[PDB]
Amino acid sequence: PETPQERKEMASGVNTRIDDLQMVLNQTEDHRQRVLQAAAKNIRVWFIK
Amino acid sequence: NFEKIENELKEINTNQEALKRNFLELTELKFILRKTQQFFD
Amino acid sequence: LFRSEEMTLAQLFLQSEAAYCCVSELGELGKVQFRDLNPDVNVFQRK
Amino acid sequence: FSPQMCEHLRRYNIIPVLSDILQESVKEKVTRIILAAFRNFLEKSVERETRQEYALAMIQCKVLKQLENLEQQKYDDEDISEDIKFLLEKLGESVQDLSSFDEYSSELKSGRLEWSPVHKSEKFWRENAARLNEKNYELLKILTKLLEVSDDPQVLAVAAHDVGEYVRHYPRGKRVIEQLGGKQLVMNHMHHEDQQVRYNALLAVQKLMVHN
Secondary structure, three states: OOOOOOHHHHHHHHHHHHHHHHHHHHHHHHHHHHHHHHOOOOHHHHHHO | OHHHHHHHHHHHHHHHHHHHHHHHHHHHHHHHHHHHHHHHO | OOOOOOOOOOOOOOOOHHHOHHHHHHHHHOOOOOOOOOOOOOOOOOO | OOOOOOOOOOOOOHHHHHHHHHOOOOOOOHHHHHHHHHHHHHHOOOOOHHHHHHHOOOOOOOOOOOHHHHHHOOOOOHHHHOHHHHHHHHHHHHHHHHOOHHHHHHHHHOOOOOOOHHHHOHHHHHHOOOHHHHOOOOHHHHHHHHHHHOOOOOOHHHHHHHHHHHHHHOHHHHHHHHHHOHHHHHHHHOOOOOHHHHHHHHHHHOOOOOOO
């Protein structure tokens, strides 16, 4: 930023963006593991079928 | 039934291998706004 | 059991509708050896 | 065969039960007339109300996707081998016709528009990259207007699919939702109890921030 009091707007801009970027990475992991809670179930019959 | 499972874990995993990089580039941006502020002061 | 077996060459007549389901019930039994009726055919066009 | 009888029998559950026999197709003569009856039902109908027999028949049932693998088989009757190409030029035209900006406008303005192939098609989102811009940003401001005042027990996921696909194809559209506050909306609706609206809102907020 090269200036004072505009990095304060920047560092609080990355502070809220990381929060919205970590709240999706915690939500996609337990959704992908909710896929493999159901889709990894019954794979052996699907190989046989 | 299978194209749902095929396209989900193909879209999510390539999202995860891209959104981790977008996240790991941003935390080293959040620290170098924090480190140079106290260094300037 | 000191001799081998007694086979048959039985001939199936499977209709159009019951062509999957009878061979499927032949798969659970599993004492049937299928002979290749069409040897001189390429890997496609096999219906 | 008579066109006056086509709109007389349409006050019934005719085509969806006729699609439920087409999935069995065990006798191979039961479905050989059903593919022929659908051509006779549409071609011998001199009106424009075959679009009602598009919105009921094939875009809401598993019969449009069944025409492809019925073509890929080696059918012997020459009247069915011409019937599969006659229904594809019919139905291919129908998918194309189905996707149009005006129709989409009705869907988010007249509202209550569901999981039709107007959202699922890439050919929809391919052309209208600036249609959300051409309505002076109000087109981006009326989809979210229905998302925030209403609970939408089923259709909440549909407009969340509308925003997630649009910000993928247009990178400047993410700044519109950042001034609008619709980013906070999809962070709330992703915690909802229904797995159909929770996943698509999860699919939307992972598409809003693809590059930062």
